[PDB]
Structure 1
């Protein structure tokens, strides 16, 4: 019907910022029903509000290696999908 639950895997950034991602992801899913837009949406918001550059990813399942900045990284599993975010300009 609408299964969904947060499950932070790891995060290194201000609570409000990481929490923002949680809502940014939740709302992102509500608007977009495909990881492509979900990630791209979240990225723009963080890149525009928190200043560039943010890299975003979303998927039901996937592994990846990535390098980011500092105090600007977060990753959490929501429902049947994962939402990754971190600056790596």
Structure 2
């Protein structure tokens, strides 16, 4: 069973998202203090590594926030935006179009 969560907006096949959820939760526990730079850096450098996630028009972007708003020319295949309920961090993942 996945760790609990809320999907505000997802567009990739679920399995890609599942991997994202598991790694993100364990990481957020692993780095429970500091700045969200480090969360973005580590998440990208993991996500950039796997032989999965092969297709990319531009390349990876990860944004974290607790209050913002955005407009994005994302690649039509991959985009995700969701929240981690213990901490309530709004986390946004995509590929540049």
Same fold (TM over 0.5): yes
Greater fraction of residues in helix? 1
Greater fraction of residues in strand? 1
Aligned length: 86
Change in Cα spacing, 1:70 to 1:83, as seen in structure 2 (3 Å) is: same
Structure 2: distance between partners of 1:61 and 1:27: 23
CA contact (8 A) 1:25 1:83 kept: no
Superposition CA RMSD, Å: 2.1
Offset at 1:28? 2.3
Change in Cα spacing, 1:81 to 1:5, as seen in structure 2 (3 Å) is: farther
Offset at 1:63? 1.4
Q: Does 1:86 align with 2:94?
A: yes
Normalised by the length of structure 1, the TM-score is 0.78
Q: For 1:61, what is the secondary structure of its paired residue?
A: coil
Normalised by the length of structure 2, the TM-score is 0.73
Larger radius of gyration: 2
Offset at 1:17? 0.4
Structure 1: gaps of 5 or more residues: none
Structure 2: gaps of 5 or more residues: none
**1:45-76 alpha-carbon deviations (Å, 9 max, x no partner):** 22222246210011222212222213221110
Structure 2: distance between partners of 1:62 and 1:31: 25
